[PDB]
Amino acid sequence: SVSVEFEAKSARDGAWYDVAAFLSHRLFESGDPEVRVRFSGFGAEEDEWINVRKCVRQRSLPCEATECVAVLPGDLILCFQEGKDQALYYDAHVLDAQRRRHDVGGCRCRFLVRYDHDSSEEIVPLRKVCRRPETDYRLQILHAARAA
């Protein structure tokens, strides 16, 4: 048994949000089915009709301090863009990574990222980075390389 959670992209800001529930569905003749979404930590007034195929995906994963080795240049990640009036998760691509020795606080690595939507670039810590679930594959590979 493996849990599968989802995140959906809002038409309001183009950011991704955790899905708490799928409330209903609607189908069109021209395609692209849509699903009514209740967002985690948001009321009913924020419910939204979401394009299922292009704006709903498997949930991005907040990184363990160990899992920094699964964040590589070229990757798509879900990155927390924190501003003065707004702080949202946006799709970004890793351009480079400065990997430094960990400490008691955990990961000390820095990642240069570029947000897909505004082309802005930012240096972020691992705590602001969410991995695409498929990168677990990499980790699994790494786990196979261990000693028995």
Binding site: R12, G41, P62, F80, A87, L88, Y89, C130
Partner: peptide
């Protein structure tokens, strides 16, 4: 695996 709290 808790995410940061998004602020719109």
């Amino acid at each position: 695996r808790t995410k940061q709290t998004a602020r719109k």
